[PDB]
Amino acid sequence: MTEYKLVVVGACGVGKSALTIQLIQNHFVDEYDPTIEDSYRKQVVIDGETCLLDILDTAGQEEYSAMRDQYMRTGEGFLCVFAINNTKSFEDIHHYREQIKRVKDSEDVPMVLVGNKCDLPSRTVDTKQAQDLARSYGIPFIETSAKTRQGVDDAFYTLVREIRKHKEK
Numbered sequence: 001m002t003e004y005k006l007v008v009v010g011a012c013g014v015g016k017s018a019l020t021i022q023l024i025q026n027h028f029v030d031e032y033d034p035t036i037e038d039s040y041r042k043q044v045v046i047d048g049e050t051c052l053l054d055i056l057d058t059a060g061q062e063e064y065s066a067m068r069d070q071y072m073r074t075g076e077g078f079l080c081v082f083a084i085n086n087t088k089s090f091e092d093i094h095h096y097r098e099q100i101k102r103v104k105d106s107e108d109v110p111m112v113l114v115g116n117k118c119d120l121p122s123r124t125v126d127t128k129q130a131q132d133l134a135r136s137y138g139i140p141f142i143e144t145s146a147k148t149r150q151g152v153d154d155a156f157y158t159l160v161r162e163i164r165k166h167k168e169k
């Protein structure tokens, strides 16, 4: 069956692990070690296609930088996550965008921008500012809550759809 290799990136604490675990296991994890990096696989149906999602939940620095370059080169699409109550996490998106493009040496890399923690009252990044950034990149923007599951399937399935559009060219 078709496999899609997805990589979830973003600053520490934005909800990469909580988003991934909601997708895979359908529960919200309140506490998951910020230093754990692991991969998960799940069979899903997207637009009638039975496929396997192979998802790497990243944790930042690696023992050796070659390990970062390896997952960036093999990954087919990237979920770039910030938290709507953490402006620094939003600013860091610029760094992830640039680094992934540089490792892959490509200007066309399937990516989706995710603003997580949308259930929280505290917000420092309004939707408009994130829409403006996504428009500048030419990629979709989705607001999510790993707690309530709002937008979770959409974020991952939209990324698969972006990979499909890239592959058909």
Ligand SMILES: Nc1nc2c(ncn2[C@@H]2O[C@H](COP(=O)(O)OP(=O)(O)O)[C@@H](O)[C@H]2O)c(=O)[nH]1
Binding pocket: 010, 011, 012, 013, 014, 015, 016, 017, 018, 019, 029, 030, 031, 032, 033, 034, 116, 117, 118, 119, 120, 144, 145, 146, 147, 148
């Ligand atoms: N309220 C709320 N809390 C969240 C959400 N996503 C993650 N969290 C919490 O934010 C903290 C960091 O989440 P985590 O998944 O460990 O972030 P990571 O470092 O990016 O993997 C944890 O305490 C989670 O419970 C969300 O959508 N809403």
Ligand SMILES: [Mg+2]
Binding pocket: 016, 017, 018, 032, 033, 034, 035, 036, 057, 058, 059
């Ligand atoms: Mg984590």
